[PDB]
Amino acid sequence: DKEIVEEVRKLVEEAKKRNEESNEEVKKLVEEAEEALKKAKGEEEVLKIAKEAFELAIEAAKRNLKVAKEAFELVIEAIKAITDDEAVLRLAELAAELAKSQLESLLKIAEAAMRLAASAIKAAKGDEAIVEIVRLLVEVAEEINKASNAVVKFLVEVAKEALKVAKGEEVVLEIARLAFELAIEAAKINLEVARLAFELVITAIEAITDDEAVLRLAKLAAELAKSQLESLLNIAEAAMELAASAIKAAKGDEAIVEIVRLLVEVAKEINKASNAVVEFLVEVAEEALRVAKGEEVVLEIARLAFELAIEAARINLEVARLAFELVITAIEAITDDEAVLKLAELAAELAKSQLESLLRIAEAAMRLAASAIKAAKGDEAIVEIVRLLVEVAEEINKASNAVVEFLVEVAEEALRVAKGEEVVEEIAKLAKELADEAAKINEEVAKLAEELVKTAEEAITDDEARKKLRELAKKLRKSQEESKKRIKEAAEKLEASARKAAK
């Protein structure tokens, strides 16, 4: 019991002092390369130094996983024994502290690699050398996400094992709460390494002369942005299974509402981290549009940033769909009309989050195009930017509709189980408001898009381009009116469900 609770306690301490030595050997490793870069008078030699230095950091990241995986595998073993639920919780808190250490050590590795790339950029005179540096840094940061998610997948595995042994309810809520906070902590570690790597691409831009490399730094920025977004999506998928497994061993209804309530909060941090990395991506594009002197390059930047924004709305949508099936699952294990009414609210709260998240994506692609207009000269290239823009807007309506239909699908299940009359009435109340909040976003998006076509029409002369820009304005109002219709039809389908299920 305590003779093996003390054992894992001593295993975590050494694993944390190995991590403390892990990035210690990395800080010394970076300073050496910085000393060599400072003195090495070369250009193919600045790259070979950064290359093998980035590779040493990638290996040290794979080392931290070899420690954490062997350490987590041991914690699982000590859970196989131990009868006391009062001492599984001890073992569960020890695993959370361990994974928070590996992720802190992983962030510290990327920060040291972040320094090395900047040292490689000063001692690099050619544009071709700068771009090969950033392409090597994106390689390191992409393995930092992969190791960060691996630590998360192995922690939520430790939680799953401790849940099967858990007999008491309050022990389960603690296990769930402890491992949700780690997914949240890991979500912010991923956002930290994104902002760092994005600011390096900025300093890489400020050293570039040609317009060719500026496009290659935007492509390299778009690569990391999808990498950061899918890395957060995997985190969301990790907390989903932990939420489902925490419910299979959940005692009663109050424990399941609280498990879903904690689940929603994680899905929030995923939306707020997704938003923050999309804004960061747009600034790098804005820093790259300001310096671009050619329209053949300006178009390629906005088009790449809009693909990111579109893919952001789709990952915003999957995280919603992940959290919505889980809410449906929780309703299946609820016997109280009070705890099923409190599962519809937390669903309608996760819906308002995805829409405010969708809007912030839209607002980001707005100022992206706005900067593209100013960096564009000629009515033709201006219209194509608006074209690529309302494409983003059309995928904001569709993702909004899908967000509402997912919520109505959840209301349809809570209704079928709500055997009480005021519950049927309450579920319908809090549901139609998300449709009013949906049409409110659909109008906010349109106003935003309305300012942009007016902006484009001002910097336009060639009458034909005005006809093209007029066909897009008609296109945009068309898509948001359809989206407005597909939202009323959802509330109409749902208003005829409190009718059936109630007297």
Author numbering: 1 to 503
What does the paper say about this structure?
We tested 33 linear THRs (with Δh = 0) with helices either about 20 or about 40 residues in height; 23 of 33 tested designs were solubly expressed, and 13 of 19 designs analysed by SEC were primarily monomeric as designed. Structural characterization of the linear building blocks by X-ray crystallography individually and/or cryogenic EM (cryo-EM) in the context of assemblies (see below) revealed that both the detailed internal structures and the overall straight linear geometry were successfully achieved. a,b, The linear THR designs (rainbow) are nearly identical to the experimentally determined structures (grey). Right: the 2.7-Å-resolution crystal structure of the tall, linear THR5 has a 0.6 Å CA RMSD to the design. b, Bottom: Comparison of the stair-stepping linear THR4 design model to the cryo-EM structure (determined as part of a nanocage assembly).
Here we describe extendable linear, curved and angled protein building blocks, as well as inter-block interactions, that conform to specified geometric standards; assemblies designed using these blocks inherit their extendability and regular interaction surfaces, enabling them to be expanded or contracted by varying the number of modules, and reinforced with secondary struts. Restricting helical geometry to ideal straight helices with zero helical twist in principle considerably limits what types of structure could be built, but this is more than compensated by the great simplification of downstream material design, as illustrated below. Using X-ray crystallography and electron microscopy, we validate nanomaterial designs ranging from simple polygonal and circular oligomers that can be concentrically nested, up to large polyhedral nanocages and unbounded straight ‘train track’ assemblies with reconfigurable sizes and geometries that can be readily blueprinted.
